[PDB]
């Protein structure tokens, strides 16, 4: 009832810093592969498995030690990170040619930022900004807008709510987020979201409106030694009602 | 060895064809795939072929030339929710190590019936008096700019869909913190109105 699983989904290391990413898989899947994705040049292979026993070497093997003590699970592991190694790394299975099919299943992907500073992660501020009457009276639409500013890294989830309940039809969130300072490397980033209902579900009174935004950050007892409160994984929202207008 | 991917991001109008090829090196290859991809989500199969000729897939079509050594994907009657990244990938091993492509992002671009294209300022719900402009309902003809200055900040466009409504709508959104901005302002760079 899981399939492949990674965890964890997000993280932020410091460079120099070791990290385990786990992988594991339901499905009694022989064969199972890691891959780095950077946004330029799609999915490489970076260790594969074939059987519980062994491992081998995909393409882009340094950098990276891997396990296949069981079946089940196979843990990729960054024994002192590189920033070039802040990328998308997704785990892959497959029967493995005991069981025919070359179908591979991938795993949701885990996202790592390396930086020079912990001192660089910051959470994301959050607002929501209520529909203008004039798009209300020409269109009979409304739309709500979400800004969440300030953040690095960019290890966001941004959600819309409607009287409790998470929605997905009439949105869009930007695929990208912008940095805040572009020609800067540890530029914190801004995203913003639309929410677009009837004019008639706007002014109505009792309806509640929430973008939520999942930030992941520091954890497990990391140090810090800062004035500002320790930006942690956590959830950040705002909210509004509807307005009779 | 290489497998070789069509650049992108390729913009399609809604109804069209999408089309995204890949050329392999090795003539020996077995098994060819086509891998979707949405933003933030991971790569999912949606094609194989293993033959010379067409495979089909309700909207998609799959076509291998051996003699040519590439595999294409065709979108047929493209939807915006197409809008993805598409991945070729091509067996390697006598145990099917796969060698992927770089991706293609395909943008497929919403058919506006009726624009109404128009700039909004919206009002934060509780933080006294800040600041954001909303442009939106514009066709997908319609160039957004980036009106470089330091501290105005503008999103490129993204497509929204109300299934309640049938309706889409493009839009952009754009701030600053308080330096002399207007909504006036904001959006004009995107390249000539109506």
């Known amino acids: 009832n899981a399939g492949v699983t990674q965890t964890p989904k997000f993280q932020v290391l410091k460079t120099g810093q070791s990290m385990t990413l786990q992988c594991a898989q339901d499905?009694?899947?022989?064969?199972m592969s890691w891959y780095r994705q950077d946004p330029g040049m799609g999915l490489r292979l970076i260790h594969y498995?074939?059987?519980?026993?062994?491992?081998d070497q995909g393409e882009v093997p340094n950098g990276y030690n891997v396990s296949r003590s069981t079946t089940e699970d196979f843990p990729l592991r960054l024994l002192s990170a590189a920033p070039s190694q802040t990328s998308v790394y997704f785990c892959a299975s497959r029967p493995g040619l005991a069981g025919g099919r070359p179908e591979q299943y991938f795993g949701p992907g885990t996202r790592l930022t390396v930086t020079e500073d912990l001192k660089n992660v910051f959470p994301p501020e959050v607002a929501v900004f209520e529909p203008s009457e004039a798009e209300i009276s020409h269109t009979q639409k409304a739309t709500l807008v979400c800004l969440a500013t300030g953040f690095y890294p960019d290890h966001v989830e941004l959600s819309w709510w409607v009287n409790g309940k998470e929605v997905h039809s009439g949105v869009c969130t930007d695929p990208q987020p912008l940095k805040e300072q572009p020609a800067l490397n540890d530029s914190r980033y801004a995203l913003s979201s639309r929410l677009r209902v009837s004019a008639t579900f706007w002014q109505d009174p009792r309806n509640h409106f929430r973008c939520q935004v999942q930030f992941y950050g520091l954890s497990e007892n990391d140090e810090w030694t800062q004035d500002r409160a320790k930006p942690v994984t956590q959830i950040v929202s705002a909210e509004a009602w509807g307005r009779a207008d | 060895k290489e497998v070789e991917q069509n650049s992108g991001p390729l913009s399609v109008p809604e109804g069209a064809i999408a089309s995204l090829n890949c050329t392999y090196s090795d003539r020996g290859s077995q098994s060819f795939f086509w891998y979707r991809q949405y933003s933030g989500k991971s790569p999912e199969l949606i094609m194989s072929?293993?033959?010379?000729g067409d495979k089909e897939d309700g909207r998609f079509t799959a076509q291998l030339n051996k003699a040519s050594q590439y595999v294409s994907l065709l979108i047929r009657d493209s939807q915006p929710s197409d809008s993805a990244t598409y991945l070729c990938?091509?067996?390697?091993?006598?145990?099917?190590?796969?060698?992927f492509g770089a991706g293609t992002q395909v943008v497929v671009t919403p058919d506006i019936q009726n624009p109404d294209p128009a700039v909004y300022q919206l009002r934060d719900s509780k933080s006294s008096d800040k600041s954001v402009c909303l442009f939106t309902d514009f066709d997908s003809q319609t160039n957004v700019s980036q009106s470089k200055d330091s501290d105005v900040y503008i999103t490129d466009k993204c497509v929204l869909d109300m299934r309640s409504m049938d309706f889409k709508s493009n839009s952009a959104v754009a701030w600053s913190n308080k330096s002399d901005f207007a909504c006036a302002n904001a959006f004009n760079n995107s390249i000539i109105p109506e």
């Open positions: 990938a091509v067996t390697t091993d006598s145990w099917g190590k796969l060698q």
């Open positions: 498995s074939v059987g519980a026993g062994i491992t």
């Open positions: 499905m009694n899947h022989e064969y």
């Open positions: 072929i293993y033959s010379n």
